[PDB]
Design a protein around this ligand. Structure first.
Ligand SMILES: [Mg+2]
Length: 75
């Protein structure tokens, strides 16, 4: 999906609670589940990518961190 499309999806789920410009891990699990179900198959690398991308260690990722995450978990 295009970054424009990706931004709309990101915003939709981040809006659920907390900072509207951040996605927590549970918000990201719901988003993947309904938006990219195929990315939640087989052994997951979600926690490893999440741990590495949440640089500030606040349990949340920004839009650019989410983009990299979708990119990487895909290959
Ligand atoms: Mg963070």
């Amino acid at each position: 999906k295009s970054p424009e499309e990706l931004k709309g999806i990101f915003e939709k789920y981040a809006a659920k609670e907390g900072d509207p410009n951040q996605l927590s891990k549970e918000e990201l699990k719901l988003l993947l589940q309904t938006e990219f179900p195929s990315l939640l198959k087989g052994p997951s690398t979600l926690d490893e990518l999440f741990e590495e991308l949440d640089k500030n260690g606040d349990g949340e990722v920004s839009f650019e961190e989410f983009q990299v995450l979708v990119k990487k978990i895909s290959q």
